[PDB]
Structure formats: structure tokens, C-alpha cells
Amino acid sequence: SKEYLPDLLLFWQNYEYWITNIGLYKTKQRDLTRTPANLDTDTEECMFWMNYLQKDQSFQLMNFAMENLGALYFGSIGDISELYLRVEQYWDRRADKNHSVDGKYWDALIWSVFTMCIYYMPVEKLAEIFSVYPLHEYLGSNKRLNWEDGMQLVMCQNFARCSLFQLKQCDFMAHPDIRLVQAYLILATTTFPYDEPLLANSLLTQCIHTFKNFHVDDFRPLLNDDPVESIAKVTLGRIFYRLCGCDYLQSGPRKPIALHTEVSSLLQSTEVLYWKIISLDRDLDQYLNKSSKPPLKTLDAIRRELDIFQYKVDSLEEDFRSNNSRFQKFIALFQISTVSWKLFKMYLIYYDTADSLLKVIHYSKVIISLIVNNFHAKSEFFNRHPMVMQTITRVVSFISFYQIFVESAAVKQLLVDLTELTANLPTIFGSKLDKLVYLTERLSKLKLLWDKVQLLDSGDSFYHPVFKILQNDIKIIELKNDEMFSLIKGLGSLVPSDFRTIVEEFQSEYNISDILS
Amino acid sequence: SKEYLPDLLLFWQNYEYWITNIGLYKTKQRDLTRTPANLDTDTEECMFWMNYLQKDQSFQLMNFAMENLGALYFGSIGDISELYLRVEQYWDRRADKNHSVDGKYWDALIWSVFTMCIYYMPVEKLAEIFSVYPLHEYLGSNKRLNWEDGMQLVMCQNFARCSLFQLKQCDFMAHPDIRLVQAYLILATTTFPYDEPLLANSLLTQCIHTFKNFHVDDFRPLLNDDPVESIAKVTLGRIFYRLCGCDYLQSGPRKPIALHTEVSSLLQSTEVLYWKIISLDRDLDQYLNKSSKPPLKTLDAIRRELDIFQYKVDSLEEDFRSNNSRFQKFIALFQISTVSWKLFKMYLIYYDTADSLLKVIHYSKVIISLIVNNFHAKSEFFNRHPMVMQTITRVVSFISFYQIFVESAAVKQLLVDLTELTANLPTIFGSKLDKLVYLTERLSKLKLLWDKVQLLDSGDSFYHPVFKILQNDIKIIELKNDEMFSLIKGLGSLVPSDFRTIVEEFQSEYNISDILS
């Protein structure tokens, strides 16, 4: 009697939290006794790359950015125009043995910008600018590869280290500047915070610190303020909501200090429309690892907010004469859709409302649509936005999970569409895309083990091998996130039995630990 | 009619806060366009010093520490014995091109220990170990100097950079460890947090982050816990209260993120006796920059707590057979005395209670006593503890300030005793001691200008040139702490008239800005 189900949907909330979120993008217990350390390999490497870039080359990036990446870089930098000047002086002082701090800070800010560019640059327009030729060698990878492969992704990664290595030249610890928060924000537009979850969390904490160090609570240019300062405050506010955004996104056990929590939910300007929407995403996902349920009255309150923000989003036109307006419209629409999907998934899980699953299937498709429509406009670099990756993960997983329990040919098809789409997302998503693919493959194998094996009522609860395996995938990731052993090493250095056979079998064939990166 | 006075004592609370505290030890607006930056001069320098230290040399430091500095290093490291092993393996791996992270972390922890040692090492016992010979040269300072001078202090400063430079090798941002918090805590025992207020605040924020990253709320080894873990928790708790302590101490505008605030005041074990007492210091000083007054009932509640802690302190014996027990007793007694002084100063200022000034004069003398008694036991290195410096500053200043307004031959003498003592505190206090001396000299010159010039009742308020000069010293320091201009540069880069003659005169002869370091 599939009467258990309700307690099983409620369970997904934690599986989502632990596996699809924490475990796949924010986990990384490394053995320090085995990790090489030094301030030498990063100095030479981030010195070579800086050489690989030519004056004109870098300037086309500036143009790719100005003519494309507006919706990302604005929030934290505003009209690049002002920055070209800096990209210019960058080279001027590029020829000096004598270098300052305001100098480097300006350097790093533009090198984080370059990072973002390489990241989004359509592989084709990138090749017409650089050539893997003088790159395969240095690195040491046969010319067996090219731009089409991660070799482009071996720049959104290294350029990123050139931004960090350069900040490490300002000794930013000792000289807080908004430019550190600005550089980080730009690096945030990429997969950097997922590649280096531990570092990114420390750099964000530094950014929270640097931000509060200005002690500005009210960003509105108040009466009789010098226009220069009225502007800096306004700017600071844009930077602020951008900062709350990646803060909420990087939430987890390895990120204990918060900033976004100092900002109230709506349940209590285009730029700020961004946080408005993320505010609602926070309002919902906050229940994933929670024990309590979102009162139904709440979901409706958020539903109503969505409505207004949905409307408000379409109300902001889009002229295809600028990729800027097109990419902004995409992020807008993707964001609301995502929150919407999350919204009805919630209804379906906590209250099993009417039209819930129908709605989930709807926004699930709206999502696949938005991504799928970007190949059809040769603005596919739009899909490289870290938001896509995140959304597809939660959507596919839940659908893939719902599929193994609640049969439906509608969902079975949707799952096919998503399964396809998954292994189609741009490749700049590296290691993770594969990890998600593996994760999908896995939850499907867990379907078979549910159709094969027989569930049985003990009278108090139901028992199945796919039930433990699910429970385990959480305990195993939840343990990979307990730093207590790490504490023990840095200190005094001291140091239903049939399923039990079925589980361990699967567990050895498909260990969740394979998702960790 | 000296009827104004009450509002003038209340004013001292802010002068103390801004000048004697923030302005003298936690201020540092530097021009980034003028600051040289690089990861080269620290790598070579912190490579030379590391060479200057010999195996046996460093090991005597270990012995100075084990046989002296127990009361400082325990809280965060516990029985050095365990660490000698590390000082040993330090050298073993000292001969490697291949170096890890757990490696460096252990290195830095012992190099922070060395720092502390050099800092406290009696100049005499230091010379019998090292020789300025191979030091004056490298640096570039004529052999015109020697250990007796800051040349010893050019180690508690460089050794400190060797601890930092080495942490910068573990990329601690990416690999949080308690050893970072432990190293910082040891560096805390020195004047490091005052030499580099901006850096120390960022390293502390990193420590708050690293600490919470363990997610341990209850430090008591709870039921059926593996003794190894029960021990690590207990350890972590010692580290925790030690961490709240330097956190409260480093409070200010440049340190926006807090940790100690997560710990309640008592008004709501020897190791924890430390925070107990600092908790009471916090309970009192929290009113310095506040607008409201400490209800009298509060002061009494703290007074009563002091009593118990005073008693509890004397109740912990002291055998002069170990400098350890002697230095612990000193810190104990100094702490309570200090809080006590603060306590009655408060009574005298906010409520003008009876025996207040008498009590202030009492603990003021008890303090001078405790410091003065350390030359008389050739354990003068006891006075090098950053606590002394801090306490003498608040005591001398207030006394020096009370002196210019409220004449008394008792205070006039006390002020003489303090004025002497001031220019007698060990020299490892460098730049600051002089700044305090200058500050004292200054408040005395402000006495003359009060005896000379004539105060006058406008009927609504009283007006005097020493009144503005006082008000100004605050606005001028309070402005040196407004980062809004720093925000403006890192961004879009845009950019009673007789006293009015008297003030500016003084102001040019004795500018408070001279205290900033």
C-alpha cells in the first residue's frame, strides 16, 4: 500500500539538500598531509598566463563583455566603459618593476573580468582570437586537444588564479577595498565558487568583512550629500544585493558566516529584481534541511509574489539588437521559472495540492524550453550561466526520483527530455556535468531495484533496499562534511538483514561518493 | 561655576574610546596608490630569518616558553611538551624540496611560538643565545644598535611575518585548520594585533570562520563520546574562550564581524577565569561609545561579581618555584585590578558615588604596584604583556585628564607616579609607548591652557579653547576612521571666535594625528 509515499516525498527535501546541493557542489574534505603547498607554482604559472594575453586580445574580451555580458557584470561594476580606461593603464604600467597596491587591485579587477569573458566567450569567437598552439605545450597536454575541449576551460580556471594571485599581491588582508568584493563578484559569474568551494567561502567571508568595513546601512543618497558620495552609496548598494545573492547561493556547512540573512524576505529597478527573486528562492529552499513544513498560507503568499514578479519581468521589453537585453531577459525568465518550479514541487510534496504535478511538469518544460531556445539563436553561451547547471540539477533529480516511485508516462517522457538536455549543457561545466550525469544514471538504476525487489510492511514501517541506499547516500555525504576528524588531526594529533546484502551490492557498483569533486 | 563638569566626565568616555583606544591602537588609513605591493620581498626576507634560526637556538626558546610563558600559550596550545616533537620534525623536514600543507601548518604554528618567545625573552637571556652581529648587516642598520634596542623588536616583528608567510604557503583560505586559529592566538600574546590592525582583523575574521566551520556548540565531552573526541572538544573550548578574548580586544570599526557577542555576560577552571574577567571588562567598557548610562544597579552587580573573582583569584596559590605560576598570578591580579579601576572610574563619572575617586586612586596605585614589583623580581618580562600597555594607557590618560579640571594634590602625585612609570614600560612596546608618552605630554599642555585662559558662561553652555581641542581630537580621529573616501577611490575613481584662534595654535603645535601609527 503506497501509503508511505508522503513521508518519502518529505525525504526528498533532504536528499535534494545533501546530494544535489551540498554533496555535488559544496563538499571537499582534502587530506592536508597529502596536499602539496607552496607560493611558487602559482607565481610562475600566473606569470605565464599573464604573458599569454596580448593587448589587443584582452581588448576584444572587453568588447565581448560590453557587447554581451552586461546582465552579469553590471550589478558589481556598472558600464564597463569606465573600466576600459583601466584596461588601458593596465598595459601602461604593465612595464614596471615598481608596482603599488591600488595598482594591483585595479589589475585583479580586470583579470577577473577576463576570466568571466573566457568563461562565456562562444568557443568559435574565442578561437578567432587565441590559439591552443602556444598552450598545449607549456601545460603538457598533447595537441590532441583544442578549444572545443576543456582547454578553453583551462583558462576560466587559470585566468581566475591570475586574479587571485594578483589580489595576493595587494595583501588584501591588510588593505580592504571594494575592488576585492568586485573581483569576487565577477568570478562569481562563473563556476569558480564550485571549483574551489573552500577558497571561495573564505574569500566571500573576506568580502562580507570588507563590505561591512564601510559601515553604510542606508544606500539611498540622502539629502544634501555630495553627488560623488551619493553615487558611491548607490553603487555600494548594487554591489550589496549582488553580494547577498552569491552568499545565499554558497550557503552550507563550509560557509558559517552570513550576510544575506541581514536582509528580510519579501514575505515580511531591474538590478534589485534579481535579489527580489532570489529572496523568494531562499524563502522556499530554507525548508529543504528543515524539520518543519511551510504552512500552506506561506506558499500562497510566495505564489502571489511570484505572480507580480512574473508579470513585472515580461513587462520589461527585449530588443534583439543587443545580446545584453536578450541575456538579461533570459536570466529573468530562467529565475522566475526556477522559483516557480520549486514552488509547485513544494505544493506537490508538502500538501499534494491539485494541479501540483501538472504545474511541475509545466515549468519543468518551460525550463527545458528556455535552454533549448538558446541553441536556436546562436546565443548558446547563455546556457553556460551557472544558474542553468544548478536548476537542471534540482529538476532532473526530483523528476528522476519521482519516476522510480510514482509511475506516469508524462513524467517518464519529461525525464527523457531532461536526461537528454543534461548531457547537452555546455561543457565549461566540466567535472560537475559528468557528476550530475552519473547521479542521474544512478537514480535510474535505483528504479530497477524498486521494480525488481519486493517492499514489505513490518506494520510499523515499510522496508526496501532502495530505501536504505537513499538514507545512506545522505549519511555518507553528511559525514564527508563533519570536520571533527579534521579538528582531531590539526590538534594533539592523536587519532531486515536481506536488504543488508542488496544495498551493499549497489553501493559498491554506484557509490554516491563518486559525485564529490 | 564648575557645574558643567558632569557632562565633561561623561565626555571622557568618548575621548577614552576614540583617542586612547581606537585612535592609538586600531587606526590606519593608508594610501594604496602609494603603498608598494608584491609577493617577493616577504618571500626572501621570511626565508633569511628562517635561516638565522639554528636548531639548538630555537629549542632554547621552546625552553624559555615551557619554563615561563605557560599562562599565555596554554589556552590555545596546552602543555608544549607535545609540541617539542613538532619542533623536532620541523627540522627533519627542514631539508625538503617536497613540502605539504599539514607540513607548513605545523611549521607556522611553531614559528608563531618562536615569535612570542622573542617577544617576552629577557633581553639578557636573548643575547646569551643570539648575536646582532649577523643581523645589523643584512637589515642595513649600523652596528650602532644592539639587543638592548628595538633590534630584538625587529624579530617579534619579522618572526611574526615568518609565521604569516608560512600560513600563506598552506593557502589557509582553502584549507581551514585549528592551527591557523592557534597560530593567531599565539601571535595575539604579542603586539602583533596593534602593529598590523588591518591584517590582524582579517586574520581574526578568518579565525572566526575557521572556528565556526567545526560546528561545535557544546564543548563538554558528552556521554559515550570517544575519549579522543572528548578531548578535542575540551581543547576546542579552551581555544574558543581565548578567541573571544582577543576578539573583544580587537573590537572597533575595522573589525565588523564578531564572535564574542555569541557569549552572554555573567550579568545575565583558571583558563575560563580569564574570559570571566574579560567578560566583566566588556560589561563595563561597552558604555564608552554608548549614549546611555550604566544603571547604578548594574555597576553594583558587576562590583559583586568582581568581589567573587577577586577572592577566587587570591585563592589560587603561587609557588615562586615556577615563573609559570608567578606570571599566571600576575595576569590574574592585573586583570581584576584593571576591571576594578574601570569600575570605580565609572562610579565616579556616571554617579559620582562616595569613595569613588578614593577607590580610583587606590586601584591606580595597585596597578603601578604590580608593574613596579616585577623589576624587583627580575621577571620584568612580565611587564611586556600587551595588557600592561593597554591598562596604563587608560589609567594615565583619565588621571591626566581629571588633573587638568579637578585639582587635587593626591591625583597630582599619582599622575607623577604614572607619568614616570609610562616612560619605563619595557621597550618592546615600540612606536606606541612614545605615542602614549606624546599623548600624556599633550593632555598636560591642555592643563596650562585651562589655567591660563578664562572660561565663560553664555547662559546655555560654557566655552573654552581646551573644550574645542578635546572635541576636535575626536572628530579628527573619527574621520580618520571613515572609509567612505577609501570607497570613493576604489570605485569609479571620481573624487566664540577668539578661541578659534587659540585652538588652532595648540592644534598645530600638538596635533592628535601624531598618535596614529
The DSSP string of B472-514 is HHHHHHHHTT-THHHHHHHSS-----SHHHHHHHHHHHS-GGG
Please write down the HEC assignment for all residues of B305-323.
HHHHHHHHHHCCCCCCCCH
Cβ count near A452 (within 10 Å): 10
Which H helix or E strand runs over A463? strand A462-463
Compute CA distances A38 → A377, B103, B171, whole Å: 46, 11, 8
**How would you class B241 by CB atoms within 10 Å of its CB: exposed for 0-12, middle for 13-18, buried for 19 or more?**
buried
Within a domain: residue B300? yes
Angle made by CA atoms A323, A324, A326, in degrees to the nearest 5: 60
Long-range contacts of B325-329 (CB under 8 A, 24+ apart): B326/B377, B326/B379, B326/B382, B327/B68, B327/B69, B327/B70, B327/B71, B327/B72, B327/B379, B327/B382, B328/B70, B328/B71, B328/B270
Resolution (A): 2.8
3-state secondary structure of B456: strand
Compute CA distances B446 → A60, A418, B441, whole Å: 63, 78, 9
- Asked if A171 and B231 come within 8 Å (Cβ–Cβ), the reply is no
Q: Are β-strands A456-457 and B462-463 bridged in parallel, bridged antiparallel, or unpaired?
A: unpaired
A169 contacts on B by Cβ (under 8 Å): 37-39
What amino acid is encoded at A72 in this protein?
L
From the list B34, B37, B100, which residue is nearest A37 (CB)? B100
| Residue of chain A with shortest Cα separation from B82 | A492
Experimental technique used to determine this entry: X-ray
Judgement on whether residues B189 and B306 belong to the same structural domain of the protein: no
Report which DSSP code applies to A286.
T
What φ, ψ does residue B463 adopt, rounded to 5°?
-125, 130
Q: Are A423 and A437 in contact (CB under 8 A)?
A: yes
- Return d(Cα B384, Cα B122) in angstroms, integer: 10
What φ, ψ does residue B428 adopt, rounded to 5°?
-60, -5
Judgement on whether residues B73 and B156 belong to the same structural domain of the protein: yes
Q: Are B511 and B52 in contact (CB under 8 A)?
A: no
B495 in reach of chain A (CB within 8 A): yes
Among candidate residues B81, B85, B152, B76, the one with its CA nearest the CA of residue B112: B76
Angle made by CA atoms B332, B338, B340, in degrees to the nearest 5: 100
What φ, ψ does residue A293 adopt, rounded to 5°?
-100, 150
Please write down the HEC assignment for all residues of A143-165.
CCCCHHHHHCCCCCCHHHHHHHH
Angle made by CA atoms B73, B78, B82, in degrees to the nearest 5: 115
| Residue of chain A with shortest Cα separation from B83 | A492
| Residue of chain A with shortest Cα separation from B495 | A228
Report which DSSP code applies to B385.
S
Distance of CA B14 to the CA centre of its chain: 19
- Return d(Cα B494, Cα A373) in angstroms, integer: 42
Compute CA distances A121 → A24, A128, A292, whole Å: 26, 11, 44
B70-77 and B178-188 helices, crossing angle to 10°: 160
Judgement on whether residues A14 and A163 belong to the same structural domain of the protein: no
Cβ count near A128 (within 10 Å): 10
Q: Are A86 and A109 in contact (CB under 8 A)?
A: yes
Give just the sign of the alpha carbon dihedral B35, B38, B40, B44: positive
Within a domain: residue A144? yes
Q: Are B435 and B514 in contact (CB under 8 A)?
A: yes
- Return d(Cα B224, Cα B229) in angstroms, integer: 10
3-state secondary structure of B167: helix
Q: Helix H segments across B53-157?
A: 55-67, 70-77, 81-92, 101-120, 123-127, 133-139
Q: Are B25 and B432 in contact (CB under 8 A)?
A: yes
Q: How far is B165 from chain A (nearest CA, A)?
A: 9
- Return d(Cα A386, Cα A46) in angstroms, integer: 24
Q: Are B503 and B472 in contact (CB under 8 A)?
A: yes
Biggest CA–CA distance in chain A, Å, is 78
- Return d(Cα A100, Cα A170) in angstroms, integer: 8
What DSSP assignment string belongs to A344-357? Answer: HHHIIIII--TTHH
What amino acid is encoded at A287 in this protein?
Y
Among candidate residues B121, B76, B126, B184, the one with its CA nearest the CA of residue B323: B121
What amino acid is encoded at B25 in this protein?
Y
Judgement on whether residues B282 and B311 belong to the same structural domain of the protein: yes
What DSSP assignment string belongs to B17-35? Answer: IIIIIIIHHS-----TTTS
Q: Residue A254 contacts by C-beta under 8 Å, 6 or more apart in sequence? A: A26, A27, A28, A197, A198, A201, A481, B213
Compute CA distances A332 → A143, A273, A321, A339, B487, whole Å: 40, 8, 18, 11, 30
Q: Are A338 and A389 in contact (CB under 8 A)?
A: no
Cell 580618520, located at residue: B480
Q: Are B81 and B66 in contact (CB under 8 A)?
A: yes
Q: Are A239 and A182 in contact (CB under 8 A)?
A: yes
- Return d(Cα A48, Cα A198) in angstroms, integer: 25
A227-249 and A178-188 helices, crossing angle to 10°: 40
From the list A179, A209, A486, which residue is nearest B205 (CB)? A209
Q: Are B213 and B139 in contact (CB under 8 A)?
A: no
Among candidate residues B214, B207, B287, the one with its CA nearest the CA of residue B247: B207
Within a domain: residue B316? yes
Q: Are B179 and B109 in contact (CB under 8 A)?
A: yes
Within a domain: residue A68? yes
Q: Helix H segments across B286-352?
A: 296-314, 323-346
Within a domain: residue B32? no
- Return d(Cα B66, Cα B113) in angstroms, integer: 11
A178 in reach of chain B (CB within 8 A): yes
- Return d(Cα A153, Cα A123) in angstroms, integer: 10
Within a domain: residue A277? yes
From the list B170, B490, B494, which residue is nearest A178 (CB)? B490
Number of domains into which chain B is organized: 2
Judgement on whether residues B461 and B371 belong to the same structural domain of the protein: yes
What amino acid is encoded at B424 in this protein?
N
- Asked if B169 and A37 come within 8 Å (Cβ–Cβ), the reply is yes
Judgement on whether residues B413 and B279 belong to the same structural domain of the protein: yes
Within a domain: residue A514? yes
List the beta bridge partners of residue A457.
A462
Report which DSSP code applies to B347.
I
Biggest CA–CA distance in chain B, Å, is 78
Judgement on whether residues B79 and B180 belong to the same structural domain of the protein: yes
B500 in reach of chain A (CB within 8 A): no
Domain boundary among A244, A269, A294: A269
- Return d(Cα B475, Cα B446) in angstroms, integer: 17
Cell 603547498, located at residue: A37
What DSSP assignment string belongs to B422-451? Answer: HTTS-GGGHHHHHHHHHHHHHHHHHHHHHH
- Return d(Cα A461, Cα B215) in angstroms, integer: 33
Chain breaks after residues in chain B, where C lies over 2.5 Å from next N: 268, 495
- Return d(Cα A61, Cα A73) in angstroms, integer: 13
Give just the sign of the alpha carbon dihedral B187, B191, B193, B197: negative
Judgement on whether residues A409 and A458 belong to the same structural domain of the protein: yes
List the beta bridge partners of residue B462.
B457
Q: Helix H segments across A78-196?
A: 81-92, 101-120, 123-127, 133-139, 158-170, 178-188, 192-195
- Asked if A490 and B105 come within 8 Å (Cβ–Cβ), the reply is yes
What φ, ψ does residue B426 adopt, rounded to 5°?
-45, 155
Q: Are A175 and B32 in contact (CB under 8 A)?
A: yes
Compute CA distances A141 → A41, A124, A137, whole Å: 18, 21, 6
Report which DSSP code applies to A7.
H
- Return d(Cα B463, Cα B481) in angstroms, integer: 27
| Residue of chain A with shortest Cα separation from B235 | A491
b (16+ CB within 10 A) / e for A80-112: beebbebbeebeeeeeeeeebbbbbbbbbbbbb
Range(s) of the domain holding residue B307: 1-27+270-517
**How would you class B381 by CB atoms within 10 Å of its CB: exposed for 0-12, middle for 13-18, buried for 19 or more?**
buried
Domain boundary among A269, A286, A301: A269
Among candidate residues A285, A283, A381, the one with its CA nearest the CA of residue A331: A381
Q: Are A73 and B4 in contact (CB under 8 A)?
A: no
Q: Are B339 and B277 in contact (CB under 8 A)?
A: yes
Judgement on whether residues A330 and A199 belong to the same structural domain of the protein: no
From the list A34, A171, A256, which residue is nearest B100 (CB)? A34
Q: Are A281 and A259 in contact (CB under 8 A)?
A: no
Compute CA distances B331 → B69, B235, B328, whole Å: 11, 21, 5
Choosing among B26, B27, B30, B38, which should be mutated to test the A contact, i.e. which has the most A CBs within 10 A? B38
3-state secondary structure of A201: helix
Choosing among B89, B487, B494, which should be mutated to test the A contact, i.e. which has the most A CBs within 10 A? B487
Among B residues 92-131, those touching chain A with beta carbons less than 8 Å apart: 98-105
Q: Are B285 and B398 in contact (CB under 8 A)?
A: no
B262 in reach of chain A (CB within 8 A): no
Which H helix or E strand runs over B47? helix B41-52
B400 in reach of chain A (CB within 8 A): no
Cβ count near B284 (within 10 Å): 18
A484 in reach of chain B (CB within 8 A): yes
Domain boundary among A225, A244, A269: A269
Q: How far is A455 from chain B (nearest CA, A)?
A: 35
3-state secondary structure of B399: helix
Among A residues 219-238, those touching chain B with beta carbons less than 8 Å apart: 228-229, 231-232, 235-236
Tally of residues, chain B: 517
- Return d(Cα A427, Cα A505) in angstroms, integer: 32
What φ, ψ does residue A36 adopt, rounded to 5°?
-65, 140
Q: Are A173 and A206 in contact (CB under 8 A)?
A: yes
Grid cell, residue B50, equals 628562517
Q: Are β-strands A462-463 and B456-457 bridged in parallel, bridged antiparallel, or unpaired?
A: unpaired
Judgement on whether residues B299 and B433 belong to the same structural domain of the protein: yes
Judgement on whether residues B131 and B219 belong to the same structural domain of the protein: yes
Q: How far is B135 from chain A (nearest CA, A)?
A: 26
List the beta bridge partners of residue A255.
A252
Angle made by CA atoms A441, A446, A449, in degrees to the nearest 5: 135
Q: Are B1 and B416 in contact (CB under 8 A)?
A: no
- Return d(Cα A337, Cα A369) in angstroms, integer: 11
Cell 563595563, located at residue: B284
From the list A31, A208, A232, which residue is nearest B487 (CB)? A232
Grid cell, residue B96, equals 625538503
Within a domain: residue B448? yes
Judgement on whether residues A234 and A343 belong to the same structural domain of the protein: no
- Asked if B216 and A103 come within 8 Å (Cβ–Cβ), the reply is no
A202 contacts on B by Cβ (under 8 Å): 172-174, 176, 206, 209
What amino acid is encoded at B146 in this protein?
N
Q: Are A99 and B38 in contact (CB under 8 A)?
A: yes
- Return d(Cα A464, Cα A8) in angstroms, integer: 12
Compute CA distances B253 → A71, A209, B258, whole Å: 34, 11, 11
Cβ count near A304 (within 10 Å): 11
Cβ count near A72 (within 10 Å): 25
Among candidate residues B21, B196, B169, the one with its CA nearest the CA of residue B115: B196
- Return d(Cα A502, Cα A246) in angstroms, integer: 41
Cβ count near B420 (within 10 Å): 11
| Residue of chain B with shortest Cα separation from A198 | B174
